[PDB]
Design a protein around this motif. Structure first.
Motif, PDB file in Angstrom:
ATOM      1  N   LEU A  82      21.892   4.793  16.614  1.00  0.00           N
ATOM      2  CA  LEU A  82      23.249   5.326  16.555  1.00  0.00           C
ATOM      3  C   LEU A  82      23.949   4.905  15.269  1.00  0.00           C
ATOM      4  O   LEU A  82      24.860   5.596  14.796  1.00  0.00           O
ATOM      5  CB  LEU A  82      24.046   4.869  17.775  1.00  0.00           C
ATOM      6  N   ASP A  83      23.540   3.774  14.692  1.00  0.00           N
ATOM      7  CA  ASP A  83      24.130   3.334  13.432  1.00  0.00           C
ATOM      8  C   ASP A  83      23.641   4.189  12.270  1.00  0.00           C
ATOM      9  O   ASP A  83      24.331   4.319  11.252  1.00  0.00           O
ATOM     10  CB  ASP A  83      23.811   1.861  13.189  1.00  0.00           C
ATOM     11  N   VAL A 114      25.896   7.547  12.523  1.00  0.00           N
ATOM     12  CA  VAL A 114      27.285   7.426  12.090  1.00  0.00           C
ATOM     13  C   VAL A 114      27.360   7.231  10.581  1.00  0.00           C
ATOM     14  O   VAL A 114      28.368   7.563   9.946  1.00  0.00           O
ATOM     15  CB  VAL A 114      27.983   6.280  12.844  1.00  0.00           C
ATOM     16  N   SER A 145      41.596  11.382   0.639  1.00  0.00           N
ATOM     17  CA  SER A 145      41.894  10.254   1.515  1.00  0.00           C
ATOM     18  C   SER A 145      41.528  10.550   2.967  1.00  0.00           C
ATOM     19  O   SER A 145      40.761   9.806   3.584  1.00  0.00           O
ATOM     20  CB  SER A 145      43.377   9.883   1.403  1.00  0.00           C
TER      21      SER A 145
END
Lengths: 49, 195, 56, 138, 73, 123, 176
Positions: A20-21, A24, A44
């Motif tokens: 999952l890291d 993301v 931004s």
RNA sequence: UGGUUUCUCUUCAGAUCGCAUAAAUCUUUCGCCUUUUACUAAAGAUUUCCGUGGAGAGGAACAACUCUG
RNA sequence: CUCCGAACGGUAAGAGCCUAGCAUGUAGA
């Protein structure tokens, strides 16, 4: 590429913190990659819609 | 053309030039000032208007975002009582104010963004900024900031109103924002650009 | 636009039309920028008396 | 002016109080003089001239007249009434009417010598009305 | 509460948090508290559009992060 | 209104003479306040008389950052005017603090490719 | 044309006489309608003509910096740099209330510390009124003693900053 | 035997030379990363700067008070 | 729980006219 990975690893992708890291980090990288092709001023807060 | 592009944005900068190819955006401001003058001349008898005498202006008036001069003014005849300043949708108007004889209406289009869809709030903001601390050529007692958003197709106005002009300008803005000869050329340019 | 008489030109601004008359090549010996102060007691006090006499 | 010590100066300071106040008021009025009239370094000339007269008043009261006490002499040199280096150069017999302490510096001249201020007129040239630019006078 | 970033030229860029219904006169007092100038001598500008001294921030539709080009009068 | 103008000019000059007299008296009142406070600590009361409060010009009303809200400082440039725009208790979610930042998977401090600092402020 | 109306006459207390007001206010006042009609020619007798015609006491007003003619005549007088007798003549003349107020601004900006307290002290006895342009452009009534006390107050005048060499208490220990 | 000070200039500093402590560079490491500089700190050694220590040289102040022996 | 970022990657592209805050301190007859 994501539908081929999430369907074949249906139970595995939910029970792996390192997997999952990677998702993301990659999805934030592609939203960074697609935003540079529009303009190159490092925005931004790009809209998710 | 007045379209503010924030970033560099090399793709969408040329696409706005392709939409605003010739003097079309300045022709929109000439078309709205001609259409509202035609609706004012058709009902000038019952509205106690002396003569609709909309004077000339600087040709880059709509381009200049700072100043806002009187574009389409209307000389009232006599005993004309001005009203309290309000927006173009407040039905609780009050005509307890000063009594003037010269009255203007300044139309300023503004191509909005996603964070500028408050066209009713933008109309009172541009009027109150360009009323006292304007340093711009405008008649003193009263005016009308009839604004027309080009992006969201929103129509709003604010300022001191005339008696009988609040349903008159509301019925005129429906025929100005819809089925205009300039806005139909504007919608044809966007649909051809997007297919 | 404007029209310069001595400079023989045409400007569009209000301050540029005044600067083309005084402050140009033709305005060298025609009222140059090197001014001169008057007398502090003679010319200055007589101007205050002439302003009071013309007003009253 | 503030004495900058607040340490109760002794006797004899009241005897030299209005004399040093008149010299201090002359230097403050010379410091407030504008830069007009002076060419390049002529504006610093009354700064050394008021400083030369201030050092001559304390040295004459200590060495020549010997009326001021040594405790008031040390308080005057510490408060800034006279420079200690200017009184040290006047103690030698070779220099008793020197113009400025900058003229006695050997490294100040480009040719590595003294100025025209520390030179007598009899040993100098005949036609010379020159004045020292660094010191201020002869 | 919107965080308007008064980012002028030459390093002068500060964050100024103000209310939505707060007037522009209250915003210049908060912008001067982070920049170090008199609040009466600050003129905010966005492409030659000098803001007034009596119009609230809710009228300009200045949302959060809407930066302003500060200038000095 | 010549007699009324002479009364107002005498009213302003009397206040200006009272302002100049209170200006020299302000140096005397500063030494008197130092003399009164020194005697108050010495032989007035052993923690039995304070005769004052907590008079501060700008209010110290604050709140709490939710989980990762930014340290927004009010700026130490004007602290003596005591204007009403300062006392507003700046602890509100401005731009990105509106989220709860606990449902989020591990941490999201800054996703703008500039995370030099590596801290969470628990150690 | 805009540098200095004198080649080499005198100097201000710390800089050029033209650079006495703020640079942000001097740049906007150099490009103005009242300035461009006046800076093409201005003499000592012409300075008394334009100052007597105007009746206003203020500085900038509006969104853009629009300088008042009181500040415009103050910069033209500072660029011309007249003698001290002409500046004392404009302060003592009772031909106009704005004429004495125009001389007081040139006195507190470029004059000496002892001369500023000596000249502005008889101006405190004036009870007349004047009109002042506010920040929003509207006119406000201000007394002559109210404007003279503001010049001896803290440095908050309309585009003016020039402290004295001391206060009134520190100057009282040395002189009257 | 005989000198308390002070300012200039000539070496080595392997003593917490510094009872306290900055920046840059080079060779390896981590985190962000989107072009780069400004970045985060773990290891080691190369400069610059804030400074200092013994020992000869030249001026000024009472060097004469007579210091140790 | 209080760890607060700055610049570049950005406004074009040109035609005719108009006005400015600047700098050097010479040998020579």
């Amino acid at each position: 590429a994501l539908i081929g990975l999430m369907t074949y690893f249906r139970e595995a992708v939910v029970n792996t913190q390192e997997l999952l890291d990677l998702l993301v980090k990659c999805e934030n990288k592609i939203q960074t990659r697609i935003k540079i092709g529009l303009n190159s001023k490092m925005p931004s807060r790009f809209p998710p819609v | 053309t007045g379209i503010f592009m924030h970033g560099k944005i090399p793709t969408l900068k040329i696409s706005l030039i392709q939409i605003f190819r010739a003097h079309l955006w300045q022709k929109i401001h000439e078309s709205i000032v001609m259409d509202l003058c035609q609706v004012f001349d058709q009902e000038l008898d019952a509205l106690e208007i002396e003569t609709v005498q909309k004077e000339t202006i600087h040709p880059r008036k709509s381009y200049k975002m700072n100043s806002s001069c009187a574009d389409i003014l209307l000389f009232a005849s006599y005993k004309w009582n001005v009203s309290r300043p309000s927006l173009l949708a407040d039905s609780k108007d009050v005509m307890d104010s000063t009594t003037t004889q010269k009255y203007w209406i300044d139309i300023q289009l503004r191509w909005g963004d996603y964070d500028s869809h408050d066209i009713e709030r933008y109309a009172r903001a541009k009027f109150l900024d360009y009323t006292t601390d304007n340093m711009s050529i405008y008649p003193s007692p009263t005016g009308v900031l009839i604004a027309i958003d080009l992006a969201y197709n929103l129509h709003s106005a604010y300022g001191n109103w005339f008696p009988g002009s609040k349903p008159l300008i509301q019925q005129a803005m429906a025929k100005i924002m819809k089925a205009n000869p300039a806005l139909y050329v504007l919608r044809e340019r966007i649909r051809k650009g997007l297919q | 636009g404007y029209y310069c008489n001595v400079c023989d030109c045409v400007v569009k601004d209000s301050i540029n039309f005044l600067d083309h008359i005084n402050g140009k090549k033709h305005q060298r010996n025609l009222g140059m920028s090197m001014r001169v102060e008057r007398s502090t007691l003679d010319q200055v006090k007589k101007r205050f008396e002439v302003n009071k006499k013309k007003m009253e | 002016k503030v004495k900058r010590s607040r340490k109760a100066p002794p006797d004899g300071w009241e005897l030299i109080e209005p004399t040093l106040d008149e010299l201090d008021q002359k230097m403050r009025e010379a410091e407030t003089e504008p830069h007009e009239g002076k060419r390049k370094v002529e504006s610093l000339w009354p700064i050394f001239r008021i400083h030369h007269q201030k050092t001559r008043y304390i040295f004459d009261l200590f060495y020549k007249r010997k009326a001021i006490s040594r405790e008031l002499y040390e308080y005057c040199i510490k408060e800034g009434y006279a420079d200690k280096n200017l009184i040290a150069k006047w103690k030698k017999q070779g220099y008793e009417n020197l113009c400025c302490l900058r003229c006695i510096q050997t490294r100040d001249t480009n040719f590595g010598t003294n100025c025209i201020c520390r030179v007598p007129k009899s040993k100098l040239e005949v036609g010379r009305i020159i004045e020292c630019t660094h010191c201020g006078c002869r | 509460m919107i965080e308007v970033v008064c980012n002028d030229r030459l390093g002068k860029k500060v964050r100024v948090k103000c209310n939505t219904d707060d007037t522009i006169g209250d915003l210049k007092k908060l912008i001067a508290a982070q920049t170090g100038t008199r609040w009466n001598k600050i003129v905010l500008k966005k492409w030659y559009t000098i803001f007034k001294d009596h119009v609230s921030l809710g009228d300009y539709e200045i949302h959060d992060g809407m930066n302003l080009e500060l200038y000095y009068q | 209104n010549d007699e009324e103008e002479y009364e107002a000019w005498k009213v302003r000059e009397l206040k200006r003479i009272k302002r100049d007299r209170e200006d020299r008296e302000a140096l005397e009142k500063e030494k008197a306040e130092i003399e009164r406070m020194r005697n108050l600590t010495e032989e007035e009361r052993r923690a039995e008389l304070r005769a004052n409060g907590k008079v501060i010009t700008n209010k110290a009303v604050k709140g709490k950052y939710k989980f990762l809200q930014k340290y927004y400082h009010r700026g130490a440039f004007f602290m003596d005017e005591d204007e009403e725009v300062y006392k507003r208790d700046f602890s509100a979610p401005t731009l990105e603090d509106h989220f709860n930042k606990t449902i989020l998977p591990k941490v999201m401090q800054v996703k703008n490719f500039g995370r030099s600092g590596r801290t969470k402020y628990t150690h | 044309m805009a540098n200095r109306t004198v080649k080499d006459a005198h100097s201000i207390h710390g800089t050029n006489p033209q650079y006495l007001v703020e640079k942000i206010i001097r740049t906007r006042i150099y490009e103005s309608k009242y300035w461009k009609e006046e800076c093409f020619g201005l003499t000592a007798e012409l300075v008394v003509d334009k100052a007597m015609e105007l009746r206003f006491v203020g500085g900038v007003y509006g969104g853009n910096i629009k300088p008042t003619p009181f500040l415009c005549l103050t910069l033209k007088m500072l660029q011309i740099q007249p003698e001290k007798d002409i500046i004392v003549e404009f302060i003592k003349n009772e031909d106009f209330k704005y004429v004495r107020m125009l001389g007081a601004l040139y006195m507190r900006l470029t004059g000496t510390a002892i001369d500023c307290y000596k000249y502005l002290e008889p101006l405190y006895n004036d009870y007349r009124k004047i009109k002042s342009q506010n920040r929003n452009g509207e006119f406000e009534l201000m007394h002559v003693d109210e404007f003279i006390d503001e010049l001896l107050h803290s440095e908050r005048v309309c585009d003016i900053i020039l402290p004295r060499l001391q206060k009134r208490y520190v100057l009282e220990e040395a002189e009257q």
